[PDB]
From a paper:
[name] glutamate receptors (AMPARs), the primary mediators of excitatory neurotransmission in the brain, are either GluA2 subunit-containing and thus Ca2+-impermeable, or GluA2-lacking and Ca2+-permeable. [name] glutamate receptors (AMPARs) mediate rapid signalling throughout the brain, and orchestrate various forms of synaptic plasticity that underlie learning. These cation channels assemble in various combinations from four core subunits, [name]–4, with each contributing unique gating kinetics, trafficking and subsynaptic localization. AMPARs exhibit a modular architecture with a two-layer extracellular region connected to the transmembrane ion channel (transmembrane domain, TMD). The ion channel is encircled by diverse auxiliary subunits, modulating receptor gating kinetics, pharmacology and ion flux, with the transmembrane AMPAR regulatory proteins (TARPs γ2, γ3, γ4, γ5, γ7, γ8) being the most abundant.
Here we determine and characterize cryo-electron microscopy structures of the [name] homotetramer, fully occupied with [name]γ3 auxiliary subunits ([name]/γ3). Desensitized [name]/γ3 substantially deviates from this behaviour and, despite the limited NTD and LBD resolution of this highly dynamic state, we could trace major transitions throughout the receptor. First, the [name] LBDs splay into pseudo four-fold symmetry in some 3D classes, reminiscent of desensitized kainate receptors, and of GluA2 receptors lacking auxiliary subunits. Second, the NTD dimers translate into a parallel configuration, where some classes adopt an ‘O-shape’ conformation, as described for heteromeric GluA2/3 and GluA2/4 NTDs. Interestingly, these transitions take place despite the presence of TARPs, whose extracellular loops remain associated with the LBDs, and accompany their motions. As apparent in 3D classes, transition of the LBDs towards four-fold symmetry largely involves rotation of the B/D subunits. The B/D LBDs undergo up to 90° rotation along an axis perpendicular to the M1 gating linkers, with the M3 and M4 linkers accommodating this motion. The appearance of non-domain-swapped receptors reaches approximately 30% and is greatest in the class closest to four-fold symmetry. Together with a study implicating subtler GluA2 LBD rearrangements in desensitization, a complete rupture of the LBD dimer interface may lead to deeply desensitized states. Closer analysis of the three sets of desensitized structures reveals a gradual transition of the LBD tier into four-fold symmetry, which is greatest for [name] and smallest for the edited GluA2 mutant: [name] > GluA2(F231A)-Arg743 > GluA2(F231A)-Gly743.
Author numbering:
A (entry chain F): 5 to 41, 55 to 84, 92 to 94, 96 to 162, 172 to 209
B (entry chain A): 409 to 503, 508 to 547, 566 to 622, 627 to 697
C (entry chain B): 746 to 767, 781 to 815
D (entry chain D): 566 to 622, 629 to 649
Write the structure that this text describes.
């Protein structure tokens, strides 16, 4: 399964990175009643909110994250550093998988991707917990929110595979 | 439709009017009151409306409806001995799920639990497999241990390395808070009632309670001097939207369609 | 004042100047354990790399 | 060594939160163990939560009027 493990890892890295970049980019994260300027049904994401019904349909405005130290929750969400931190490690992880077949002499290159993909997922769940807690303090999530949750699973499975590849690479080196 | 006149109607008062007419020896035509109101003296115009108005102004000679005997009415019309007893009473709407066991923890908590279960098991696999000092904690075994330690059931393997034991230590603490909170929240859910309770202080609550407009009950509440009834009247007169109704059927449907929010 | 009251003027002025102005447990209160958890793995992952580098050299 | 008797012993131990000297290894065996553990967690939590509600908290005249096992009388010449 050495060839298929190579083929599975590259697309999983590309898919997980592609799944978050649209998830952060799009604004279909939440469905709740609000005002995009009288309040109508709205769809809001990480940065902007736009009403999907009414006279102001399609009109988008920046989300006011700043309308008591434990302020940090608003600041972390206002900067949204964790969701973009998750994308950066996924971008970094892909490069380490990309350079895995070029510098075959070093076995630590493929481990760097494995730990990065696991680390990307850990920022994924933290970004999700911050987002859920910040918005709480009826509602529904669009496909953008589930893009992040599915990106977390794909990145973690690739992280397991990459480390699984490393242990076999060093096992055959010992033998 | 097959019948017309006094013969078009039925009911207790119809037969009572028939029997009274038989005993008194007179012919009669059952005229339904036009206003559809029982009777009241409008404080502004001082005009009697409904059946009492029909009787006083001469348009009618008898009233055989469920007309309550009241002091204000006895001052302007004559009443016979009561033919039925009654009192003001409260009418309230008399009115689990297969997956209800997930209620104590919201739908958000479960998603993060399965994310944490996947997150920690992978981390336990990584910190215990990449170490050349060690190499039983593969991906499958790690999933079994973390899943096993979730529901307090133990496992055939325990972490030995420092990295593995820290991961197990926080999850062992993590599962303690979640399991204890779920049981504690379920106990609150299973722990948390009619009576002039909501009619003790009265409604007290969104359980808005109304009366029929231009009825003896409204007049009874208006002219009451009992503390509870005065409190109820002050609430009913000022409450918006109008708690009062125009007909008994209207109040009945209001309670049936307020789903236990209207008394 | 009696004329203004009988002509509805006072009511309109009042309405214009006063009225026309006008149990499931959540992630919010259990977010602490998740915060402590992810801090546990981040520290545990660092400890593995520190001990792995120490063991190698 | 999960024989019929051992499975009965393991399931009784697993259901009652006491653990066991043997645990399933195969994927098929572990799926059964996982769902049983999840089931026993809900029932045990349900039992304690409902007992706490019971310990923290005829009952009518109609009840007394409907029945006839409890005799009811009046005053004579009243």
């Amino acid at each position: 399964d050495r060839g298929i493990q190579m083929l599975i890892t590259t697309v999983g890295a590309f898919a997980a990175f592609s799944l978050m970049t649209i998830a952060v980019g799009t604004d279909y994260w939440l469905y709740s009643r609000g005002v995009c300027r009288e309040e109508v049904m709205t769809h809001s994401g990480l940065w902007r909110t736009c009403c999907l019904e009414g006279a102001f349909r399609g009109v988008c405005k920046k989300i006011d994250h700043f309308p008591d130290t434990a302020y940090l929750l608003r600041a972390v969400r206002a900067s949204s550093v964790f969701p973009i931190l998750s994308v950066t490690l996924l971008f970094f992880g892909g490069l380490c998988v990309a350079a895995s077949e070029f510098h075959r002499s070093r076995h630590s290159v493929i481990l760097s991707a494995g730990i990065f993909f696991v680390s990307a997922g850990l920022s994924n769940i933290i970004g999700i917990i911050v987002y859920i807690s910040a918005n709480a303090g009826s509602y529904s999530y669009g496909w953008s929110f589930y893009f992040g949750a599915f990106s977390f699973i794909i990145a973690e499975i690739v992280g397991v595979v990459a480390v699984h590849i490393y242990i076999e690479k060093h096992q055959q080196l010992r033998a | 439709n097959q019948f017309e006149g006094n013969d078009r109607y039925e009911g207790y008062c119809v037969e009572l009017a028939a029997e009274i007419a038989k005993h008194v020896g007179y012919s009669y035509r059952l005229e339904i009151v036009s206003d559809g109101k029982y009777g009241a003296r409008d404080p502004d115009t001082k005009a009697w409306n409904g059946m009492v108005g029909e009787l006083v102004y001469g348009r009618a000679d008898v009233a055989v409806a469920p007309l309550t005997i009241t002091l204000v009415r006895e001052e302007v019309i004559d009443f016979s001995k009561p033919f039925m007893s009654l009192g003001i009473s409260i009418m309230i709407k008399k009115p689990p799920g297969v997956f209800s066991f997930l209620d104590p923890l919201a739908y958000e908590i479960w998603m993060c639990i399965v994310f944490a279960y996947i997150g920690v098991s992978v981390v336990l696999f990584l910190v215990s497999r990449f170490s050349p000092y060690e190499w039983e904690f593969g991906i499958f075994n790690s999933l079994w241990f973390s899943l096993g330690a979730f529901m307090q059931q133990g496992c055939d393997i325990s972490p030995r390395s420092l990295s593995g034991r820290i991961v197990g230590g926080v999850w062992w603490f993590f599962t303690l808070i979640i399991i204890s909170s779920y049981t504690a929240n379920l106990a609150a859910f299973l722990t948390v009632s009619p009576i002039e309770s909501a009619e003790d202080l009265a409604k007290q609550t969104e359980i808005a309670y109304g009366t029929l407009e231009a009825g003896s009950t409204k007049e009874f509440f208006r002219r009451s001097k009992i503390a509870v009834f005065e409190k109820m009247w002050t609430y009913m007169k000022s409450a918006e939207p109008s708690v009062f109704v125009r007909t008994t059927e209207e109040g009945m449907i209001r309670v049936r369609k307020s789903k236990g929010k209207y008394a | 004042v009696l004329k203004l009251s009988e002509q509805g003027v006072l009511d309109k002025l009042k309405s214009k100047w006063w009225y026309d102005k006008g149990s499931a447990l959540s992630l919010s209160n259990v977010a602490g354990v998740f915060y402590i958890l992810i801090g546990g793995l981040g520290l545990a992952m660092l400890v593995a790399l520190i001990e792995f580098c120490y063991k190698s050299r």
